[PDB]
Design a binder for this molecule. Sequence first.
Ligand SMILES: [Zn+2]
Length: 46
Amino acid sequence: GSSGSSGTGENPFICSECGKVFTHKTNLIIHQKIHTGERPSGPSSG
Ligand SMILES: [Zn+2]
């Protein structure tokens, strides 16, 4: 009977997308860019 969880060590920032920690908030924002850059399926509408 053990939860087996963890979480001891405050963090500056984390990419909710993938989960990458960055020293500066600027470095993180610049990274997230990779997450925001995909094209939609297409014209498929009807
Ligand atoms: Zn990311």
